[PDB]
């Protein structure tokens, strides 16, 4: 209807005002204003000396099992996210059905919990002793 | 009089700070003590080697006005001797170790720090731990750089 | 983690928010540089002069 | 009655040339430069760089008991590409030398230099062979703070003289059109402006007084 | 273009960018805002100086932030450096673009809402992510990773604590949320959610205490300090946007958004969005920053099976209802 | 919503071009989160809101780790980015791109023989497919949870450090 392409037209001028803005700002924020002429200019700043290597290096991580975890994790939200919508019309085997989904959510968490996952903090401290 | 803070037997962050806090209670009662209990007598000693000697006779004495020009120009001649000094400090314990050549400059001056020791310490307390864990050690050790290399 | 250390920390920090408030609805206790002057001691250790005598020669 | 400093990396530090040039100071285009001068005075984002004991006077100053929020200078950035004042508030050693020389070519124009304390101003007390004596050996120092250390309404009233310092000069509103130098006002020393005032005092307070 | 559908596309478009250009301003304002509330919280004035109560402190701001040179690192890779301030100025802008201000004033009428929230949160992420990588420094490297395990932490939970206001309404849509909430206000039966979108919506601003990734003390300002000029504005105006944006959708989902029994519509909108943005300015002062692994074992043990059961026992509760 | 359709798939297109023939992984990966942009834009257009809703939820949070494993692996400059153009060398791709062109005409060419009405574009919410994903689908709702606890299973197993 008439308020439908009100409502979509007004969506794409927000979203075109919006990348307009942000775009004139970056260009007025990049043509004014002098430039710098210095030896220690393109240095990335590690406090005042040098770098020992660069800050290109295979860094390592702990969040790889949580980052999985998070997907997964993700996936069974929107699967209940599905199931928000409609929770009137699907009545209470739905409901039953949903509790059975939530039950294997919460032992899947449980038992990640215990075996480990979930924990990847230095053996040295662990907020003990 | 005033007690003294003695923790359970580690030495976490969170037990320096309130044994920290702890001090700074005693150190008010120290204040209170002394405020409500204030001594009427000299300000300086009536020894002759006190540099500077007493304002007032060095404004109108002539052996008074000898001392203080003697001794604000080339300084107090302190014997040969070696003496040492040590204190608790606010952030441990500070020492002054003066070796004296007989002249008026110390031959010989040594100031122990605690914040020394302390940074030495670090490696050892430290090794294993998170960078957040370093920020807060750094952070609950009370050190102060001049402190540190004097 | 405890239930219980949970709930202590959840009051812990609306206790916090509440001290803060508190703060908030104080008094300020600024000293409006250079709006007010600031009050110094009379042997406070500042800019250094020479002086004059009484009959109007310097002392020095 | 103005200066001119040129900058160009290709011996000795600091890498500039300042010569004794005279104002050029147009109906729209000096009122925008009063306005981008305003702007940039009024709002100032100290370096958070600390050496020594005057670091912890500046953050006394920082502090809310007297509150140099008001004019616009407590945001204190940890970064030099976002900051925009130097307050050298400590003892230039000679091993940091090097590293205050790096974190002042990190930092971007328009820059100012504030030296706080008798360290930062000529080396102070410290007449040592591991300082180097004043931090204006290699860098230049907009405003002067004498002390020991200053107390922190001196730190403010060195950022007001900042201020008024940069109220009056001139700067090249973009990179690709005009000239590139930047032109600072030679004001009147403080010294000359306050010898009305100070020859004049005649009595003070005792010391036996509170 | 005389005709009453055109006029009425024509006033949509015009309170469409209306709302645009004062979210935005009240974004800026609001900076100015959290210094002059800091300054109140912290026993100080703050900038008071620049016109009548330092009103003009934020324009002499943004002049030295145009006329600050915008410098873009050699070592940096320069699209993805231009990139992530784009980002961020823009997704959480989108994500305020559903939320109804008042009856007969919102943008878009989205039949997924909340959702595009969450598609907007999830696109936000790789503005930090982005400026983490891109600026090539170690402390923006560890920011950035930093950012990306917070962003785990809230991520997993915040739809879920979101689900209970979305099955109390029944529907996706904006309007029908703040309808539902005619009789009482959603923050009652939903305060476990209400909490735990506390949490995750200060975790998507990447606010006080959850500022792992720009955090002064820690890695000393973070993924953005090779970010200079206007760009590091940018980022500033982004997650301020960002803070009223969560504020605005808190006053929606759990507040009726403009519902009130005496004041206009848009005035209690306001007043609410005003006070969540009063708590966000409080919420920085008072408590500290916890380690972020622990963040994320809170967000991840705690929070989340709170959240499911929150889903399940109102689930429960709008059946027995039935 | 024609032409968004056509430039969301245009757009799909030369991202999904730019993705498998690129040196930089975190270039690839903003080119794959621009070209699953415009699948969602695709979702969108054809009425199918909740497809384009989770395209843009669940796979930004999977192409998320994605990126952390690209920053934790293979960033080391130039060097990853030498090492993959040796790889790539022109006889290497049009062997199988003939392969790939052979079989997307015989894919086209049994797509266009079947009858067709053209997409009227109604929209389906949420609402429906929450009630036949409860509905008629239940199982495949709870053996899928079973499938997502067998996949974190496995990745806690392999992804281990020790
Ligand atoms: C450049 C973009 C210009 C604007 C494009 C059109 C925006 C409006 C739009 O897409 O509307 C369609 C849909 C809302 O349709 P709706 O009103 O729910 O359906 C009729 C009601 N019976 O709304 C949607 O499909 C909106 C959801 C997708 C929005 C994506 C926004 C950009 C994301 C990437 C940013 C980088
Ligand atoms: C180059 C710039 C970006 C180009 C792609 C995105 C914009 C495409 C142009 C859209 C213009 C608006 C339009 O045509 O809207 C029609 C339609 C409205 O929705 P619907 O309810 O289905 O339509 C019936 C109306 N009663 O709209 C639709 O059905 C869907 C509209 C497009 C999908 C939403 C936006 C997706 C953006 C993807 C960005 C990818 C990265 C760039
Ligand atoms: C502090 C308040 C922040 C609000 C952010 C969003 C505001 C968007 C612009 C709204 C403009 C229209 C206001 C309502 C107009 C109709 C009602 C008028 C009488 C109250
Ligand atoms: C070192 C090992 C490298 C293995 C590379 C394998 C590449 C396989 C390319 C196959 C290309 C086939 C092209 C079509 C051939 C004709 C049709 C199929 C056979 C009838
Ligand atoms: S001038 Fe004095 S207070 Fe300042 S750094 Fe030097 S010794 Fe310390």
């Not at chain 2, 000898?66 to 040492?84: D, K, R, Y």
């Not at chain 2, 490696?123 to 294993?128: D, M």
């Not at chain 5, 995750?200 to 006080?208: E, K, L, P, Q, S």
């Not at chain 6, 992984?25 to 009425?47: D, E, K, M, Q, T």
Request: charged share 15%; proline share 5%; glycine share 8%.
């Amino acid at each position: 209807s008439t308020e439908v392409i009100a409502h979509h037209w007004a969506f794409a001028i927000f979203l075109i005002v919006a990348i307009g803005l942000c775009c004139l700002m970056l260009v007025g924020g990049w043509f004014l204003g002098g430039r710098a002429r210095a030896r220690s200019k393109n240095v990335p700043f590690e406090s005042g000396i040098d770098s020992v290597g660069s800050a290109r290096l295979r860094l390592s991580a702990k969040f790889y099992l949580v980052a999985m975890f998070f997907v997964i994790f993700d996936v069974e939200a929107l699967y209940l996210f599905a199931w928000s919508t409609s929770i009137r019309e699907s009545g209470w085997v739905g409901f039953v059905e949903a509790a059975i989904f939530i039950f294997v959510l919460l032992a899947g968490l449980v038992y990640l919990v215990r075996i480990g996952a979930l924990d990847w903090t230095p053996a040295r401290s662990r907020r003990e002793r | 009089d005033f007690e003294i803070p003695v923790g359970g037997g580690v030495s976490d962050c969170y037990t320096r700070v309130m044994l920290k806090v702890e001090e700074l209670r005693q150190s008010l009662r120290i204040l209170e003590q002394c405020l409500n209990n204030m001594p009427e007598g000299p300000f300086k000693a009536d020894h002759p080697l006190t540099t500077p000697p007493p304002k007032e006779r060095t404004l109108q004495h002539i052996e008074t006005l000898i001392t203080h020009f003697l001794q604000v120009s080339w300084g107090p001649v302190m014997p040969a001797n070696e003496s040492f000094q040590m204190i608790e400090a606010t952030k441990g314990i500070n020492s002054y170790y003066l070796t004296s050549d007989g002249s008026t400059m110390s031959y010989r001056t040594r100031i122990r720090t605690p914040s020394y020791a302390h940074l030495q310490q670090i490696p050892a307390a430290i090794r294993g731990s998170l960078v957040s864990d370093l920020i807060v050690y750094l952070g609950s050790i009370d050190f102060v750089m001049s402190d540190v290399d004097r | 983690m405890t239930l219980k250390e949970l709930l202590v920390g959840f009051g812990t920090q609306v206790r916090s928010i509440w001290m803060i408030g508190l703060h908030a609805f104080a008094k300020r206790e600024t000293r409006m540089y250079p709006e007010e002057p600031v009050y110094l001691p009379p042997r406070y250790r500042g800019r250094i002069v020479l002086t004059r005598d009484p009959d109007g020669e310097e002392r020095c | 009655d103005y200066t001119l400093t040129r900058i160009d990396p290709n011996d000795r530090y600091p890498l500039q040339k300042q010569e004794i040039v005279t104002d050029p100071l147009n109906v729209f285009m000096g009122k925008l430069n009063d306005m981008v001068n305003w702007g940039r005075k009024n709002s100032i984002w100290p370096y958070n760089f600390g050496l020594s004991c005057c670091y912890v006077e500046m953050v006394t100053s920082f502090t809310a008991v007297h509150d140099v929020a008001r004019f616009g200078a407590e945001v204190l950035r940890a970064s030099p590409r976002q900051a925009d004042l130097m307050v050298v508030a400590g003892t230039c050693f000679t091993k940091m030398a090097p590293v205050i020389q790096r974190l002042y070519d990190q930092m971007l124009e328009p820059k100012w230099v504030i030296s706080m304390g008798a360290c930062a101003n000529s080396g102070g007390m410290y007449d040592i062979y591991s300082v180097v004596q004043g931090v204006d050996k290699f860098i230049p120092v907009d405003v002067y703070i004498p002390g020991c250390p200053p107390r922190p309404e001196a730190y403010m009233q060195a950022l007001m003289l900042l201020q008024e310092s940069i109220g009056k000069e001139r700067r090249p509103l973009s990179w690709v059109v005009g000239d590139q130098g930047v032109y600072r006002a030679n004001m009147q020393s403080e010294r000359e402006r306050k010898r009305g005032e100070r020859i004049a005092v005649t009595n003070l307070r005792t010391p036996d007084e509170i | 273009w005389i005709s009453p559908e055109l006029i009425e596309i024509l006033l949509t478009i015009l309170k469409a960018v209306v709302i645009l250009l004062v979210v935005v301003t009240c974004g800026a304002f609001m900076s100015f805002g959290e210094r002059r509330l800091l300054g109140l919280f912290q026993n100080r004035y703050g900038p008071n100086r620049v016109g009548w109560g330092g009103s003009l402190q934020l324009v002499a701001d943004m002049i030295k932030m145009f006329f600050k040179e915008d410098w873009i690192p050699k070592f940096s890779d320069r699209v993805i450096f231009t990139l992530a301030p784009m980002i961020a100025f823009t997704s959480l802008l989108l994500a305020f673009a559903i939320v109804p201000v008042s009856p007969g004033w919102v943008v878009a009428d989205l039949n997924i809402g909340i959702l595009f929230f969450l598609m907007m949160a999830g696109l936000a992420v790789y503005a930090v992510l982005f400026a983490g990588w891109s600026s090539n420094n170690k402390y923006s490297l560890l920011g950035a990773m930093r950012a990306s395990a917070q962003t785990l932490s809230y991520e997993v939970f915040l739809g879920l604590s979101l689900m209970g206001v979305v099955a109390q309404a029944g529907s996706f849509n904006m309007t029908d949320i703040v309808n539902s909430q005619a009789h009482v206000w959603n923050v009652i039966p939903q305060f476990f959610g209400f909490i735990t979108f506390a949490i995750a919506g200060v975790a998507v601003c990447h606010r006080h205490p959850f500022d792992q990734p720009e955090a002064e003390q820690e890695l000393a300002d973070g993924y953005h300090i090779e970010y200079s000029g206007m760009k590091f504005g940018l980022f500033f105006v982004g997650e301020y946007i960002g803070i009223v944006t969560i504020s605005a959708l808190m006053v929606t989902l759990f507040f009726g958004g403009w519902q009130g029994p005496l004041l206009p519509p848009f005035i209690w909108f306001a007043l609410k969005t005003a006070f969540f943005m009063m708590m966000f300015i409080l919420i920085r002062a008072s408590l500290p920053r916890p380690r972020y692994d622990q963040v994320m074992s809170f967000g991840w043990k705690i929070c989340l099976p709170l959240t499911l059961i929150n889903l399940l026992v109102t689930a429960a509760v709008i059946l027995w209802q039935a | 919503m024609e032409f968004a359709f056509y430039i969301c798939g245009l757009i799909a297109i030369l991202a999904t071009l730019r993705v498998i023939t690129h040196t930089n992984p975190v270039h690839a990966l903003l080119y794959l989160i621009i070209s699953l942009l415009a699948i969602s834009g695709v979702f969108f257009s054809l009425g199918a809101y909740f497809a384009g809703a989770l395209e843009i939820i669940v796979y930004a949070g999977a192409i998320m780790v994605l990126f952390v494993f690209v920053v934790m692996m293979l960033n080391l400059g130039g060097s990853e980015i030498e090492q993959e153009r040796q790889w790539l060398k022109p006889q290497v791709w049009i062997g199988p791109a003939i392969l790939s062109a052979i079989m997307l005409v015989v894919i086209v060419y049994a797509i266009l023989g079947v009858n067709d009405q053209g997409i009227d574009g109604t929209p389906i919410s949420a609402k429906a497919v929450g009630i036949t994903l409860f509905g008629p689908y239940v199982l495949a709702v709870e053996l899928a949870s079973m499938l997502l606890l067998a996949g974190l299973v496995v990745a806690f197993h392999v992804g281990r450090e020790e």
